[PDB]
């Protein structure tokens, strides 16, 4: 029942009785969808006008100053990007698209009101506007050769919000929020007086605003309190409040008051605030299209506030999802573009002031400098923008879906506590509550749920199924958060009689958004899926319901930190969410059209597509694999093809898995037999014990790639040389170094070995007389140059997979450098030309097959089109400035070195289970020592039972029993296939193994005998089982599976100690306990330091291990030392150890000498503090007191 090539190769058992009403929506849709609306217009969507085009149209007309010049926008043209994303990243250039717009200017006599501009400037031209960054189909941005992801931002929606502080009774408040600009506020008072403020200022009556414009007793109390006599007086008072100590002006105040709230550019609602305000007052008379504030709107807001004080109405909830909206990265890009456009418009108005030309074209006035800088500044320095995590494919999906309220317009980390961190009732359908940072940012990540979707207004919506006449309809609809509160929704778990009618009279459902017991008749909707509430990352964990929420959150955060192994192993127990996660992430290749593989090699895939069952196409497509691609986490990424020659394939099938993917399924862990008994105190707490077979079998070995860059710069004294000709260096050390001075590719480098050699000149050596005598005795000259070669840090071992060199610009290349560059270009073009010919040769063979079928004009230009791309590829390599980059002026040359070193799990490493149980390996034991079953198979890992009782992670025990059942099922299949390997009996054995339990009915009959033999070989290690997160198989089904395996109906089994061979009293549960390794190696954490460089300002040691590191001494540690009374330890550590320059040298000499002496005259930091005080008028000095 696999129905797919990936499914056909291995068949995974499935569980649960819930039908799949709707398939999961695309995970990356939210990131991809926002960019398209900004850069594209769809008639069906109704997005006729692109946002960028609308922004250009709004500010295009200027009419500077009666110059007979008119600026009109005609059209926008987008230039093709110079380099593809793969080429841009290798070069380090940022993927970008040129933006061009058409401006028409009309000129004429420019007389006083006659024929000013109707007879001139009939000529118009396209003017370059700037460079716009482009988004890949994966929705990621490459900047400076670095991939980046912009997190979505959640911000309070523009509108009118009424809230009352409880400090005083009747203290209601009215707030109006604009999309941009200042927002006015109204505050009630204990006396019942009304006050109006703008953002911040002196308190004043709200009546002043009405005076400027032109059962209620509140107006009477407020009117008498204010002494304002006329609107002019009120306007002068408002101007004085806005600026203090500034004289009022007759026309100055009028322009300022209208400008603050009556300027369209200055103040706009964005069409969201106006829509909310009209709905809140329910008035259609005010124009919805105009986003500017109106006198009627302000009077209505004041009326609503008075009505709330009367007691008719309800206060709004800020925490409510409907009030909060999510802002896409493209909207931020649009805002930056608008700011740049405003600056450009101001420049154009100023630019017209100087004219020195005849029939001047409208190209000189346009300036593109302002727009490019703002967008680049936002992308490079954007707080929301950050490097995407490369640890695993799941991590990349988690980061893109993440929405952060933090950033501009966002609450500060310490500002908001105990309010936004909680989960609202509306959060169930929009944001998964089990996933959040355990750090202070906890409760702000608000990771988006898998089924969560974004409406055009930016409000998240959740799919639901309507119910008619007590009968559930199959129609699926999306409900807004505000709409959802009124309706009552029943959970999908509720059973049906097959007529879509609820059997139970009383069911648990949310009518007010809070779970309650209600009759089936009142229910109006049903949940589309059980896992809809949980996030996509949460669904991966099996037996989620059995696990505690805190432990589940800890496990979910830990799984994303998992590090990929050399061989991917599919988990025996899986929710089945892994296959969707792998397909959605672009780490695997999917065939565009149905075709039969023509040639397969581990560098590219060639496929031929049949036109009869497919739309018209070239008939040949080529897919290029990526081998050992470097990652931000320094994790090797490579793609291996699962396709075979002459293998039928269909669109959407995975030709080959790429990163952390096995057979189209994401695997971050290896299955190991696990026992649950305390051993010798090796795991007293969270410690984990490893048999060592995994270390020997390379079960947990990972490959890390390290890039080292050496650059050459021109100093004032001289230009530094990377040539490997350094005095005082032996030939054997330089023997690995090539004649060019760059280490040979593929050559193992010991720690501290020279990767590149550089010499920098020195002057005014001023050698001391003893040094002079030494030079005279040996006739030794003093070098005027010093060597600063690049060497790998100690404790690091690797081989050089790739070497990159960039030459100088504007300088003719040397024969070795110039010849090397030409040779590299020819090899890339020559390999491409032969490779391009190979594709051309395959097309020619296909034509020969179709020679009877007419190819004379059918593919005449097909070869020509391929030739143009090859020429462009040759041009692109020579299209560079000659250094492959600008290089930054003052940089002579740069070199890039890539080293890949394998890593194997060792003691002190950290392993975290999917259930959230985590441990650090304490020791490695011999295979004989590890406990074994009566069969004698060893137990790879032993776990502590006490920890499971303390934390309710009951899911892990159930998974271990399920894993044991899967292990038992595999052994029976191995016994059946060990002898008499015939398809007919194997089919019966497979029917018993899969159809014995469950209603899945895999229908293995469809698979041919040849497929059956491969499937049996694949299942030898284990039989895959898929469990729904809330639809997991019950204990009875697992017990039946254990019986089929022939194991007793319990997890525990008899075991014998290896050392004495005597069985332990009491049986011990054995489970697969699938495990993953977190990215926390102990190799980089050792941080051993004895003597290190000191901070220049404080003469104190550097920290963090960046250079020599060292451990800072805490103030609390000083308190503990004072409690101990060890003054000698405290005094010595503070002076000689840290800032005593005289003491440190003396201490080092004494330690080398071995003689005992102590000098602690003073600490340098105290002297620096006295100097800082001395600069101020206050004077601090040491003194002697005889009094």
């Amino acid at each position: 029942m696999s129905y797919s090539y990936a499914e056909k190769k291995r068949i995974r058992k499935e569980f649960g009785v819930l039908p799949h009403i709707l398939d999961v929506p695309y995970l990356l849709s939210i990131q991809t969808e926002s960019y398209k609306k900004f850069l594209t217009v769809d008639a069906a969507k109704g997005r006729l006008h692109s946002g960028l085009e609308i922004v250009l149209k709004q500010s295009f007309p200027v009419e500077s100053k009666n110059g007979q010049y008119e600026l009109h926008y005609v059209d926008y043209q987008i230039g093709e990007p110079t380099f593809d994303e793969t080429e841009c990243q290798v070069r380090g250039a940022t993927y970008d698209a040129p933006l061009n717009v058409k401006l028409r200017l009309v000129v004429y006599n420019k007389d006083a009101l006659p024929n000013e501009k109707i007879v001139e400037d009939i000529r118009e031209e396209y003017v370059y506007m700037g460079d716009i960054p482009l988004m890949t189909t994966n929705g990621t941005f490459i900047i400076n050769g670095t991939e980046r992801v912009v997190v979505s931002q959640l911000h309070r929606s523009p509108g009118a919000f009424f809230s009352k502080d409880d400090s005083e009774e009747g203290a209601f408040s009215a707030r109006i929020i604009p999309y941009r600009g200042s927002w006015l506020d109204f505050e009630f008072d204990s006396k019942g007086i009304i006050w109006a403020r703008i953002d911040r200022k002196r308190k004043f009556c709200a009546t002043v605003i009405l005076k400027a414009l032109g059962r209620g007793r509140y107006i009477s109390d407020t009117l008498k309190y204010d002494l304002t006599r006329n609107t002019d007086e009120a306007l002068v008072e408002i101007y004085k409040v806005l600026r203090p100590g500034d004289p009022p002006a007759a026309a100055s105040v009028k322009a300022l008051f209208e400008g603050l709230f009556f300027i369209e550019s200055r103040y706009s609602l964005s069409d969201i605030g106006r829509m909310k305000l009209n709905a809140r007052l329910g008035s259609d008379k005010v124009s919805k299209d105009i986003y500017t504030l109106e006198n009627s709107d302000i009077v209505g807001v004041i009326e609503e506030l008075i009505n709330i004080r009367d007691g008719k109405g309800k206060v709004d909830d800020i925490d409510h999802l409907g009030n909060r909206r999510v802002r896409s990265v493209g909207e931020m890009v649009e805002n930056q573009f608008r700011i740049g456009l405003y600056r450009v418009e101001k420049g154009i108005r100023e630019s017209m002031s100087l004219v020195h030309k005849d029939k001047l074209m409208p190209k000189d006035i346009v300036n593109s400098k302002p727009i490019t800088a703002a967008i680049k500044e936002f992308f490079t320095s954007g707080a929301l923008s950050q490097f995407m995590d490369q640890d695993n494919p799941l991590s990349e999906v988690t980061h893109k879906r993440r929405i952060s309220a933090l950033g501009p317009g966002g609450l500060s980390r310490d500002r908001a506590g105990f309010e936004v961190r909680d989960v609202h009732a509306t959060h169930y359908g929009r944001l998964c509550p089990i996933e959040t940072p355990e750090g202070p940012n906890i409760g702000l990540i608000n990771s988006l749920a898998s089924y969560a979707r974004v409406n055009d207004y930016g409000f998240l919506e959740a799919p639901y199924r309507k119910v008619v006449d007590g009968k559930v309809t199959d129609e699926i609809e999306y409900l807004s958060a505000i709409d959802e509160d009124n309706y009552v929704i029943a959970q999908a778990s509720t059973k049906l009689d097959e007529n879509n009618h609820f059997v139970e009279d009383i069911i648990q459902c949310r009518s007010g958004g809070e779970a309650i017991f209600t009759e089936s008749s009142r229910v109006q909707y049903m949940d589309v899926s059980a896992k809809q509430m949980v996030s996509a990352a949460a669904a991966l964990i099996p037996f989620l319901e059995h696990d505690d929420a805190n432990r589940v959150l800890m496990g979910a955060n830990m799984q994303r930190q998992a590090v990929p192994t050399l061989k991917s192993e599919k988990p025996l127990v899986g929710t089945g969410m892994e296959k969707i996660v792998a397909r959605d992430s672009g780490n695997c290749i999917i065939a565009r059209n149905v075709g039969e593989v023509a040639e397969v090699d581990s560098n590219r895939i060639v496929i031929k597509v049949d036109t009869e069952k497919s739309q018209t196409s070239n008939l040949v497509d080529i897919y290029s694999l990526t081998k050992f691609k470097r990652s931000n986490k320094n994790t090797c990424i490579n793609q291996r093809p699962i396709v075979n020659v002459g293998d039928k394939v269909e669109a959407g099938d995975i030709l080959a898995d790429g990163f952390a993917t096995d057979f189209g399924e994401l695997s971050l862990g290896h299955n190991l037999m696990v026992a649950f008994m305390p051993w010798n105190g090796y795991n007293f707490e969270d410690s984990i014990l490893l048999s060592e077979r995994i270390v020997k079998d390379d079960k947990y070995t990972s490959i890390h790639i390290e890039e080292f860059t050496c650059v050459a710069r021109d100093t004032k004294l001289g230009p530094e040389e990377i040539t490997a000709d350094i005095p005082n260096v032996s030939e054997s050390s330089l023997a690995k170094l090539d004649e060019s001075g760059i280490v040979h590719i593929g050559a193992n480098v010991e720690a501290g070995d020279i990767l590149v050699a550089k010499i920098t000149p020195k002057a005014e050596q001023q050698l001391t007389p003893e040094e002079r005598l030494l030079r005279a005795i040996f006739n030794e000259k003093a070098s005027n140059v010093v060597d600063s070669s690049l060497r790998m840090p100690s404790g690091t071992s690797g081989t050089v997979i790739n070497v990159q060199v960039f030459e100088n610009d504007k300088g003719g290349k040397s024969k070795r450098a110039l010849k090397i560059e030409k040779e590299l270009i020819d090899k890339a073009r020559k390999d491409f030309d032969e490779e391009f010919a190979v594709i051309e040769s395959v097309v020619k063979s296909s034509i020969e097959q179709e020679v009877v079928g007419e190819k004379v004009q059918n593919a005449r230009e097909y070869y020509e089109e391929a030739k143009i791309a090859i020429d462009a590829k040759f041009e692109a390599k020579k299209k560079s400035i000659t250094q492959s980059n600008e290089l930054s002026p003052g940089v002579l040359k740069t070199v890039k070195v890539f080293v890949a070193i394998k890593k194997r799990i060792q003691p002190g490493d950290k392993m975290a289970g999917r259930h959230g149980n985590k441990g650090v390996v304490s020791r490695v034991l011999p295979v004989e020592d590890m406990p074994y079953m009566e069969d004698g198979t060893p137990v790879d890992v032993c776990l502590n039972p006490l920890g499971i009782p303390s934390r309710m992670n009951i899911g892990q025990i159930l998974e271990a029993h399920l894993g044991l059942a899967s292990y038992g099922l595999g052994k029976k299949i191995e016994k059946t296939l060990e002898k008499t390997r015939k398809a007919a009996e194997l089919r019966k054995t497979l029917e018993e193994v899969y159809n014995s339990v469950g209603d899945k009915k895999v229908n293995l009959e469809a698979l041919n005998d040849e497929e059956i033999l491969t499937l049996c070989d694949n299942l030898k290690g284990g039989v895959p089982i898929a469990t729904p997160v809330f639809d997991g198989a019950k204990e009875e089904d697992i017990k039946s599976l254990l019986k089929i395996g022939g194991f007793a109906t319990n997890g525990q089994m008899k075991l014998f100690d290896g050392r004495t061979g005597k069985p332990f009293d009491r049986h011990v549960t054995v489970g697969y306990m699938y495990m993953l390794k977190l990215d926390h190696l102990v190799d980089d954490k050792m941080h051993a330091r004895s003597t290190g460089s000191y901070s220049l300002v404080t003469q104190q040691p550097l920290g963090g291990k960046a250079q020599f590191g060292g451990q800072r001494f805490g103030e609390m540690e000083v308190w503990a030392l004072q409690a101990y009374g060890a003054a000698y330890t405290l005094r010595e550590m503070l002076t000689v150890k840290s800032d005593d320059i005289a003491g440190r040298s003396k201490m080092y000499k004494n330690i080398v000498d071995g003689k005992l002496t102590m000098n602690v005259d003073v600490p340098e930091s105290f002297n620096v503090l006295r100097n800082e005080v001395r600069a101020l008028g206050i004077d601090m000095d040491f003194d002697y007191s005889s009094e």
């Binding site: 600026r243 203090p244 100590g245 500034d246 004289p247």
Partner: peptide, 18 residues
């Protein structure tokens, strides 16, 4: 006027513009 405004530019301009 003498509003106690801290900024010098506002104070200087008022005298200069008289």
């Amino acid at each position: 006027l003498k509003g106690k405004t801290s900024d010098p530019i506002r104070m200087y301009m008022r005298e200069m513009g008289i």
